[PDB]
């Protein structure tokens, strides 16, 4: 089995327009979140949320090929053209077949679909957008990329709400890993926020309403969370064959060690109250890296501070590290950026990368009150350097579908 | 030791195409940015720049001679020319060894590389241009100037990028002040807008990209500014030494009484927050004229509108003017002409030299919203006829390369 790196990385989040910047957030414990300024929600229980601010399509895609393509695809793009960038490598006739692309996205293109839905209620079919196809459906950021760069390597995209970017990025390893790529783009993107989206999210009463505190709202394993905050953006990472990587002289981040998978079989939005599920899936990626649970330095939460769900990952992280639980680092950045569902496993893999670069443990900010049982090393408040050989990032979606990827310094 | 005395002065600029029409646009506060029309720049980021219109190089050069030459020679010469012309200069054998020419550009030929490379790539290369090294060389406005004039005194050409025009025409008063020439023309051109100019720029993200509203881009200090504008032409001062002046009677519109240089030595494109580099400039040209920081009354900034550039600027004048710094006015004159690269520091001087000459601080157009600590008089909206005794031109360059002229009104 071929071994994968991370040659280059992109974003778009709350806290910044490209990687450095939200890094910079990140490590600061800096909110994204803020009341939303682009439609009027005075109807809707939850009107905050993180936005990307300040976001210009034509630093990259021609003002004519914008118009035509949904925020969610523009932000795809945008972070998959950083990653790209970032990776310096050169596309060729020798390995464009061997150049791939796997970005997803949680619920696509709801606000083009929400846009067109009014125009067809107003004034009849006839008003639809020729575009609305091509540039709503998911798999068009795999798409719109491989056109943009010849990409004629494996193409497709992962739709598994939170799950998404998690499992976009370990399929993509495993494509490299058995020889079907030797590189592949892989990530996430979202842009959910609309009437059906902070409506749709609302209705399910899966959603904070502290519309008071905004940048308070995001509380992982704090005893007062009451839902998850939503948010847009992007991650995409360049994932090569190390071989391949050495040949052209590539800076490597990390390498990609693992990839895990399971499922609750419990509930439609529910977890088991032990994590079980995210207890398997957490083992199923170490016994992929073929790492001891007592060689992880720190592990990116899903932690999206809903009553359920956090508490159940605390108790999937006790039954697979023992003792050794109290000595790692767990942080849920979400508490800064919020839940970018399909885009949230990209930006989480790109800050366990960088934790690893940098040797420091992000912050979970807003934990003044940890729940019971919530006694780990949650990282309150602010930022700590340490040791990190090993980073996990774990990702838990809607259906019980768990994913987790395990990242190492290189050597 | 010798004195050096301004006696001529030509220009090209987006505000028009001698000085007296670009300097009646300054003082009306006109902008000269507009919808780039030579090329379509539908697929770039940045669609607006600061042109010269309506030029004919046939008032200056036969149409054979003409087409050998890139546009930035061309824009040279003109300039170069207007300023001779100015002086009522006559060379004769008595003084032609005594007269040379320091004109310069910060990049040069880059219209004429781009289509002579076309060529190149599609049909090989016996398609390139016999006249591709000597019409495109960045010392030829400086070498055709003196073969049209017959000028024989020290002739070179400077490339300090922003700073070009700032340290040609320093450099010429040096010639004339220690005795190798008695007249020196002097100053820069540049026509950088060509598909690697304006591409090459963006890709840097160096560039406003407030394409709706190109008159509103280019704005100094002000907290919205989001990059520089680029701008085309040039500008030529006929530098001579004051007795020399005296005995011809030649008209003396102002006096180069000091010129100082300094490197930051910290980023290729960055300035340091607190603009010592810049500060150590100021403080070596008023050092260079025997002049006391406080009997500065006029400054023409850098003022590129640039987030990092413009507050650095405010931080040196603070820094080396004191309280005095509230009592002097400075303007950015770039708010109305764009940033012209290799020919800001040309135009900015002849623009010094007639804040002398008219007692009036031209304004900064465009400073709606002064950013934190932009609290100085920087002559927003409108022009402020005052007192000028001395002027300041300061030219800041990618690199960290740092000139500062001084002029004085003459007796
Ligand atoms: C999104 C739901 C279904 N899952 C969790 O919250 C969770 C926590 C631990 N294992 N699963
Ligand atoms: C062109 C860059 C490198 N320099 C400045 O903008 C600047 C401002 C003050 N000192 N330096």
């Not at 071929?2 to 989040?13: A, C, D, F, H, K």
């Not at 003002?63 to 932000?75: C, G, N, S, V």
Request: glycine share 12%; aromatic share 6%.
């Amino acid at each position: 089995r071929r071994r994968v790196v991370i040659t280059g990385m992109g974003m778009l989040s709350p806290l910044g327009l490209d990687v450095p910047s939200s890094w910079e957030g990140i490590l600061a414990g800096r909110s994204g979140i803020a009341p939303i300024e682009h439609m009027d929600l005075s109807a809707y229980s939850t009107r905050f949320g993180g936005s990307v601010k300040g976001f210009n399509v034509e630093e990259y895609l021609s003002a004519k090929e914008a118009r035509k393509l949904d925020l969610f695809i523009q932000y795809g793009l945008a972070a998959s053209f950083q990653a790209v960038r970032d990776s310096g490598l050169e596309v060729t006739d020798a390995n464009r077949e061997r150049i791939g692309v796997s970005m997803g996205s949680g619920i696509g293109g709801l606000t083009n679909i929400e846009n067109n839905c009014r125009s067809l209620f107003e004034q009849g079919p006839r008003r639809i957008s020729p575009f609305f196809v091509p540039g709503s459906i998911i798999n068009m950021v795999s798409g719109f990329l491989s056109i943009h760069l010849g990409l004629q390597g494996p193409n497709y995209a992962l739709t598994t709400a939170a799950t998404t970017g998690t499992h976009s990025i370990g399929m993509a390893a495993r494509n490299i890993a058995y020889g079907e790529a030797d590189v592949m783009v892989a990530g996430g993107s979202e842009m959910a926020a609309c009437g059906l989206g902070l409506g749709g999210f609302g209705a399910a009463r899966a959603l904070s309403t502290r519309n008071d505190e905004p940048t308070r709202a995001s509380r992982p394993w704090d005893r007062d969370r009451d839902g998850f905050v939503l948010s847009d953006g992007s991650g995409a990472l360049v994932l090569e064959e190390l071989e391949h990587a050495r040949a052209r002289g590539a800076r490597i981040y990390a390498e990609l060690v693992g990839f895990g998978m399971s499922g609750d079989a419990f509930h439609m939005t529910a977890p088991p109250e032990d994590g079980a599920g995210a207890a398997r899936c957490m083992k199923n990626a170490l016994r992929d890296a073929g790492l001891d649970p007592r060689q992880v330095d720190y592990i990116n939460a899903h932690g999206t501070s809903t009553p359920a769900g956090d508490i159940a990952e605390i108790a999937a992280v006790k039954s697979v590290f023992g003792e050794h639980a109290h000595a790692l680092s767990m942080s849920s950045t979400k508490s800064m950026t919020g839940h970018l569902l399909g885009a949230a496993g990209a930006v989480e893999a790109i800050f366990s990368v960088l934790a690893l670069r940098d040797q420091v443990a992000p912050p979970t900010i807003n934990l003044d009150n940890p729940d019971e049982g919530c006694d780990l090393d949650l990282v309150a408040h602010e930022a700590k350097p340490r040791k990190i050989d090993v980073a996990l990032s774990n990702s838990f979606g809607f259906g019980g579908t768990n994913g987790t990827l395990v990242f190492r310094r290189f050597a």
